Enzyme design. Structure first.
Site, PDB file in Angstrom:
ATOM      1  N   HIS A 130      27.217  47.214  38.682  1.00  0.00           N
ATOM      2  CA  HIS A 130      27.673  46.561  37.419  1.00  0.00           C
ATOM      3  C   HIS A 130      27.202  45.097  37.344  1.00  0.00           C
ATOM      4  CE1 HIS A 130      31.671  45.492  39.477  1.00  0.00           C
ATOM      5  NE2 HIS A 130      31.160  44.333  39.074  1.00  0.00           N
ATOM      6  N   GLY A 161      34.191  37.218  40.104  1.00  0.00           N
ATOM      7  CA  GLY A 161      33.177  36.722  41.054  1.00  0.00           C
ATOM      8  C   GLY A 161      33.354  37.307  42.453  1.00  0.00           C
ATOM      9  N   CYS A 215      33.695  40.596  43.177  1.00  0.00           N
ATOM     10  CA  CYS A 215      33.032  41.920  43.266  1.00  0.00           C
ATOM     11  C   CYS A 215      31.911  41.855  44.317  1.00  0.00           C
ATOM     12  CB  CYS A 215      32.532  42.389  41.904  1.00  0.00           C
ATOM     13  SG  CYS A 215      33.884  42.761  40.758  1.00  0.00           S
TER      14      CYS A 215
END
Ligand SMILES: C[C@@H]1[C@@H](O)CCCN1Cc1ccccc1
Ligand SMILES: C[C@@H]1[C@@H](O)CCCN1Cc1ccccc1
Lengths: 304, 304
Positions: free
Chosen positions: A41, A143, A145
């Site tokens: 993503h 941030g 992830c």
């Protein structure tokens, strides 16, 4: 003496954290050998995130669109592929800090440390369990992830988790390092409802053993029970069933303390039926389920 | 979202842990530049530990009696001195992994990470508070002495704690890195009773703010109070007094949430008077006091 929610030392994983930027999205990547692993993503605008088509989004992407930064030095991307829900960015430099490592897909109720990172930089480490509904209850801001979950066996880091999503209910979902989601979740900003958040029964019993070992014994009662009888009560209280496998796993703690597993089950049963009556066990007012039998033995024996 | 008991990443400290052996006693040392810091009780037999005379025990010791091992490589000791309750072993090699560091003496209620080690090898990391009675509630087995407590400010490790003793009540005492004990404790196996284990009020309020920020608001009430009124209640419940300094420190959390500090005090007062009625706050059934206001801001803003 003393029992603490203890994370693995994070140094070996700190050395693998990088920053991955695709367009305006920055998140964390895991640099092992000459591959950087990150959530796919990274290629999405939060607009995309409503119904993203990753294959179609990836056609528009080139090696040079993936900006990979390890400290203040840029890594050259020489290839990229999608594996399930992760991107593998091939770089021209093997991470010199690569520890011995494996990728493992853990089971629900298993525990691991998370190194929470932002822009490829570690902010903290905490100890988690994979919930029976395959969520985790983390601490993750935008941030974070690509932050990873791991176990260490002496010098070998077993990576089990990469952080991808916050469900609308504020619980966390991610993948193993092959990019397969734990649970029925998908990397889409949609209606995703987690199932029943049940208690990991075997872990509670482990932690009751840890309490006895560390001098907290007020909850030990005069009763025993059977697996079937205990399981009827467990079910009523949204506790996962206890199997003979769980009893076998608790064997060494049973042995060390001289408290039969079914006696400890009868103690847990009364705690469920009667509550703590305002008392605490190892400084907790509820029954802790984020220590495995293995964790209790490890910490009570001082494994490095 | 989510709030976790988060330790600092431990890598920078992992790189400073060594094994110190004097005779048959092995414990942990901290290698910074060309000095290894360890508990002076490394020179004791547990017999000595009843009434040890460190100056007299040290006369019998030479540089070559202190065996210092960093991984599987031996460090040459070229000098040793006693500073308060620590030994400083001068070695001929500067630790190449020395991070930027300071030695800080923390105040009671301040939080820090402990890297629990055995034979100079890290086993785990957890987040602590210095209790108001200057004990800590750690997880420490025999061989863990010389394990250290630290804070990290970006790239600077502030070392605040070295582990020395387990009191007969299973709570922990140690020194700053100048070797001065926190609290009235001494490195002797004697009657040492800790004072009242009170709750760190300012930390509870910080954590109530963390709860509001993360969506747990059931405990917010319609009431306010005054510092004096709140403090009368705090005292009854073995809570440390709240000062104007604490109110000022909570200012940013007050600002972010729009809940005045004295309103949050009135919420805490009712929680003390009425208990949780079986409810939880950030997955805890008691009021957590091991997050500072600084910790709540750090974790809620994602500082690295
Ligand atoms: C469906 C849940 C889920 O959390 C994981 C798998 C098993 N669970 C079953 C369950 C439900 C209710 C009480 C006890 C057990
Ligand atoms: C003596 C204790 C000790 O824990 C640290 C310093 C202050 N404390 C005073 C105290 C006692 C009882 C209730 C509230 C406060």
């Amino acid at each position: 003496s003393g029992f603490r929610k203890m994370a693995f030392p994070s140094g070996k994983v700190e050395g693998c954290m990088v920053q991955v930027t695709c367009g305006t999205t920055t998140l964390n990547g895991l640099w092992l050998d000459d591959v950087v692993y990150c959530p796919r993503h990274v290629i999405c605008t939060s607009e995309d995130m409503l119904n993203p088509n990753y294959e179609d989004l990836l056609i528009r992407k080139s090696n040079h669109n993936f900006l990979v930064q390890a400290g203040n030095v840029q890594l050259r991307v020489i290839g990229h592929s999608m594996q399930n829900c992760v991107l593998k960015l091939k770089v021209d430099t093997a991470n010199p800090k690569t520890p011995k490592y494996k990728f493992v897909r853990i089971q629900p109720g298993q525990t691991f440390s998370v190194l929470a990172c932002y822009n490829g930089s570690p902010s903290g480490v905490y100890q988690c369990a994979m919930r029976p509904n395959f969520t985790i209850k983390g601490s993750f801001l935008n941030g974070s992830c690509g932050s990873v979950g791991f176990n260490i066996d002496y010098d070998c880091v077993s990576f089990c988790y990469m952080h991808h999503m916050e469900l609308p209910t504020g619980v966390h979902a991610g993948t193993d390092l092959e990019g397969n989601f734990y649970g029925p979740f998908v990397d889409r900003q949609t209606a995703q409802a987690a199932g029943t958040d049940t208690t990991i029964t075997v872990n509670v019993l482990a932690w009751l053993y840890a309490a006895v070992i560390n001098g907290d014994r007020w909850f030990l009662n005069r009763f025993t029970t059977t697996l079937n009888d205990f399981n009827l009560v467990a079910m009523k209280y949204n506790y996962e069933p206890l199997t003979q496998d769980h009893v076998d796993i608790l064997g060494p703690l049973s042995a060390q303390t001289g408290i039969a597993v079914l006696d400890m089950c009868a103690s847990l049963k009364e705690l469920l039926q009667n509550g703590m009556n305002g008392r605490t066990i190892l400084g907790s007012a509820l029954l802790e389920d984020e220590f495995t039998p293995f964790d209790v033995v490890r910490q009570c024996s001082g494994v490095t």
